[PDB]
């Protein structure tokens, strides 16, 4: 087990986002004491801060993360990729800090088809928001009230791929899946 600071805290105090310079420090990090931001500057680079663009392969470094005490904000993501592979092993989001003081998990306008958060089993506080992912299926299948642990939590799934359009293609929970829902089309992606 290893605890590491999040974006905006400690050595990342003025870091706007996980980027090519600071992603190395998250190696073997199983718990993040703070927030995680993934923004377009990450993959575009930033001249003023002398930050090179991020290699989408290095996002595998976060696979070891199993806990985040703050919130998770993903407003940018490589399009060649179909899901959030890096957060495969993320198990808990406590949301002691929250985006705008409300949201503990935000996915905004990604090319992903599935969330791919297999291990996520609790969201202690804060509201979930999944917005603008025009290819994202399987979202409404899961019962998010089972993950919530605080009263007042609500999910806001809007402007995403219509549930009917997802059904036509065949991108629905697998046969073996139970009513609990599914994170992806594969059985290993099932709750």
């Amino acid at each position, epitope marked *: 087990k290893k605890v590491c600071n999040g974006i905006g805290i400690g050595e990342f105090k003025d870091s706007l986002s996980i980027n090519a310079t600071n992603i190395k420090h998250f190696k073997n990090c199983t718990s993040i004491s703070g927030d995680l931001h993934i923004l377009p500057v990450a993959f575009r680079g930033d001249s003023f801060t002398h930050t090179p663009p991020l290699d989408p392969q290095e996002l595998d470094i976060l696979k070891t993360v199993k806990e985040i005490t703050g919130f998770l904000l993903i*407003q*940018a993501w490589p399009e060649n990729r179909t899901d959030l592979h890096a957060f495969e092993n993320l198990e808990i989001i406590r949301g002691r800090t929250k985006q705008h003081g409300q949201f503990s998990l935000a996915v905004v306008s990604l*090319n992903i088809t599935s969330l791919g958060l297999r291990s996520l089993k609790e969201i202690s506080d804060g509201d979930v928001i999944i917005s*603008g992912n*025009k290819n994202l299926c399987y979202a409404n299948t899961i019962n998010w009230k089972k993950l919530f642990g605080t009263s007042g939590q609500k999910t806001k*799934i*809007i402007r995403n791929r219509g549930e*009917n359009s997802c059904k036509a293609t065949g991108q629905v929970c697998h046969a073996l899946c139970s009513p609990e829902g599914c994170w992806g089309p594969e059985p290993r992606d099932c709750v």
Partner: T-cell receptor
């Protein structure tokens, strides 16, 4: 304060391309909190959603326009633009630009003239 | 697309009356529905969002209810200013769609 204003030629010939640009004030279009959308209203009819553009370059377009729409941003001048090619009479309309607060109300809150 | 239907397309009403505007959806839009007001020459103005929450600066006489496929905008007492067209709007599924519009005309 937040203010949106449209600008562009009012007369386009059929089969040509329609170009509009929306100048934003009181805020930066480059932000993860806001979508930037175009809506149109043919004279005497309802409202049609065209699409939105996000600061990350992501876009969404209405299938009803059959891929004839593109949108771009110019963070330098704090503008975002709309291009619609192969226009006919059915594209005659009042074109509006509107903002959305992804983490606020969640729908068009500020409109242009 | 999710088609939004507003019936009737015209309401003849007198000042002080209670107006009731309806909006149906071909598919469930959960609670992700807004109401807009449009006066001739101006752009739509947001009244309600999440089907029931009034926006800032909207008199209390405006109110919304409903969920899923059937929604209602209620005006407790029409004022002279409230004679305009009202659109329902769904933001829950893309592509985004608007209702046909319901005009409120002065009865005489």
């Amino acid at each position: 304060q937040v203010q949106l204003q449209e600008s562009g030629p009012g007369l386009v010939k059929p089969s040509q391309t329609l170009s509009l640009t929306c100048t934003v004030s009181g805020g930066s279009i480059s932000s993860g909190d806001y979508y930037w959308s175009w809506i149109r209203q043919p004279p005497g009819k309802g409202l049609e959603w065209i699409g939105y553009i996000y600061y990350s370059g992501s876009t969404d377009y209405n299938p009803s326009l059959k891929s004839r729409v593109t949108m771009s941003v110019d963070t330098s001048k704090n503008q975002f633009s709309l291009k619609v090619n192969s226009v006919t009479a059915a594209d005659t309309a009042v074109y509006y630009c509107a903002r959305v607060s992804i983490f606020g109300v969640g729908t068009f809150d500020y409109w242009g003239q | 697309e999710i088609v939004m239907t507003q019936s009737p397309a015209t309401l003849s009403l007198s000042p002080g009356e209670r107006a009731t505007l309806s909006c149906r959806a071909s598919q469930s839009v959960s609670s992700y529905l807004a109401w807009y007001q449009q006066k001739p020459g101006q752009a739509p103005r947001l009244l309600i969002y999440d089907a029931s929450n009034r926006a800032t600066g909207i008199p209390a006489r405006f109110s919304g209810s409903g969920s899923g496929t059937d929604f209602t905008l209620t005006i407790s007492s029409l004022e002279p200013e409230d004679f305009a067209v009202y659109y329902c709007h769904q933001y829950g599924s893309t592509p985004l769609t608007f209702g046909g519009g319901t005009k409120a005309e002065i009865k005489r």
